[PDB]
Amino acid sequence: NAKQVRWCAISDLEQKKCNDLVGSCNVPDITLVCVLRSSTEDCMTAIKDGQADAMFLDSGEVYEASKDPYNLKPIIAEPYSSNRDLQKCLKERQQALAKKMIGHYIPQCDEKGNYQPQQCHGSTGHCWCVNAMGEKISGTNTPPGQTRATCERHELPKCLKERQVALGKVLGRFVPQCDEKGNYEPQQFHGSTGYSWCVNAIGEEIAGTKTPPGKIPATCQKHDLVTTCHYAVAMVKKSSAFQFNQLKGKRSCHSGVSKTDGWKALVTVLVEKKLLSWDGPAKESIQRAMSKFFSVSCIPGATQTNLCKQCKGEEGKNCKNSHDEPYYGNYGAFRCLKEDMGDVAFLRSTALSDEHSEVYELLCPDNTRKPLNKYKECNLGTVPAGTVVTRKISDKTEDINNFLMEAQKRQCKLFSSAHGKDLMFDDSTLQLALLSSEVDAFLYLGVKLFHAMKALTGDAHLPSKNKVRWCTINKLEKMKCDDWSAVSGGAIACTEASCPKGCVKQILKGEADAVKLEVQYMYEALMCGLLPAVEEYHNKDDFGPCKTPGSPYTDFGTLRAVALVKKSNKDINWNNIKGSCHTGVGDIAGWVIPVSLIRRQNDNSDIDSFFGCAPGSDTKSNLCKLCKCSLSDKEAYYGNQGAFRCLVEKGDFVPHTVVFENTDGKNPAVWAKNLKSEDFELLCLDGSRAPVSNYKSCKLSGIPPPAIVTREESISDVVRIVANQQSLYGRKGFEKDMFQLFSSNKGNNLLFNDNTQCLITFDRQPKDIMEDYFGKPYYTTVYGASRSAMSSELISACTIKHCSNSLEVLFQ
Ligand SMILES: NC(=O)OC[C@@H]1N=C(N)N2CCC(O)(O)[C@@]23N=C(N)N[C@@H]13
After folding, report:
1. Ligand 1: which atom is nearest the Cα of residue 705?
2. Can you give the residue ranges of the Thyroglobulin type-1 domain?
3. Whether the CB of 532 sits within 6 Å of ligand 1
């Protein structure tokens, strides 16, 4: 029935606005309640205690909020416009139609879902022109009763036109590789010359990343072009004459001690410019070093008296993280500078307006001054948007989201008030969208910014070059790793995660050093800059590579994905497979490799309508009938052998080893006992029906081996410690009676697969690391040889956001 959402207010003005929303905003079955506290930190505590449910935090406060004594988590935030947004016109049309208002602009889309080149605001009669991303072409807005601008289609991305400008007069210049939708691949390979280099979002080469053919190519990050960026700036009056390197001793006003635009961006610049004498957060609090840097200041929330001297709040509210302090916030910091209580104001660029351009200007970190409109060139760094937070337990996230989504639909005045600016939310907020429940402080801030916040609060870990922290995914692995650590002589330590993805995050966060990953997780890990140090070797026939490291191997023990049929017992070939059964929807050989080939050779729909048992593929489906159909042992057609039972029972895609298993009498069953290796064989493309013994040639694809990944700067140490530990323990080790790497009484396949022969150091080749790990057939088949084949919250956190006024640049 009726639920309630308790919003926390840090000030009297915020409670006045919040109570206005309680009266004027009617959301059915949700009741808004306003809880009052005296500061930002007291509101975070109230949410932690269950006294309130939601509040809005600056991005600079997200990291500290995620820890004791707050333990808060971002749930709702304003989305930015990226150059990777799909079906944007359709989504934007739905949102506008969802608004409970009449006469608002509703974007117009064609049949394909693209923007119509001309967009009109029906209620006002104004029309304008737009590119493929919906951005208004400058100057094309016309009122009713006036000749309209004629609108061209701007649908050709920047790269795709460069392909056919270089494809041309039989020249020899280079052609770029770009993923679908025309975006530049971050890694570029020159066809004529073995050179490799890397580009940003708009395809221009970054810098020192070009490499000759014989050398290892650079490790290069995915870039995204994002619009509307806000910046941290230092604002000063034109009357003053000092520059940035003369800030010491001056009077300053800051939006807040915990805010990026008021403190954290400034401290980063002061340290990099060597203007701030600071030993470090372990030796000295950053506030103490800053207290000696400035003479007197107003920095709301500060615990040094001189940093609170210039504040204007009445006693009990002076220097508080609250609008009760008149100088709090971006506009509060501007007010102090206006009233000559400080010589410089540190605030967000959103508080800049052309009205201030007469008296005010910007203080640039290169010791120059520039006008306000040059803030994109005169700033202390980008500031990501704030976010709504709640408890990590996330008990009331659903109720909080339903309220804000409904309040936005009903045009409630969330982002403005007569009482003041930036109350409850940033006034610049256009909309708030729900975040994935996977998102936390690390994923929201991103890998680079997270470490900057971690280092700034003195939680930065420095890994020991002589110890490897190994991440586990369950209690049994933790027990075996503890057994390993106790016999490692300080070389091995153990961390705990719930899944391999969590282990990858811990390595990126600096909380762990190494983990073994199956093939499914390698795409994200390699995308985030991790690298394989050692890999599981499974060739039980050859021991040369294990006994002596560096000696070559003939077969790494890889599985090969193949399609097994009987020899003309059935007359099937690859080209008439329409009208087979698979191990499982998630398995690589059973599903990933075949389905990737199918969709690649004729762009269509595999989900159904291509075949005439594939567990985990819904029910009442084309294949789920042949099996019920659960991705579980309880289905008798699940797994490697389960897919073998399907080939014999109404047979029409498995690893190569499965046929040799059960055959020749190996599996005691009523069905698969009296069949032999001459009865079955495999489908190759265009070749077909090799005697199942010609795999490695009659294969759909090879499957790369499991890899142990780590950071690039930890590669040499991890392999060194693993190699030393492998000589002691594991198969044929000096102290193998003390402990075993590839077997355990705690369980099976802990940390590594128990059938692993040994770990072999990864031989890196002068090739793309995605190709270098996966191999060209697997990389091309499964992921299209592209860095954009899959997207996720983890990959987004590992993606560099590159600011641009508009996406327009990608179209001309
Ligand atoms: N075939 C094979 O099994 O490869 C063994 C080992 N492991 C890989 N995942 N690779 C990726 C591709 C590759 O070149 O085959 C190899 N690449 C390097 N640096 N060592 C090889």
Report:
1. 9
2. 86-151, 156-220
3. no
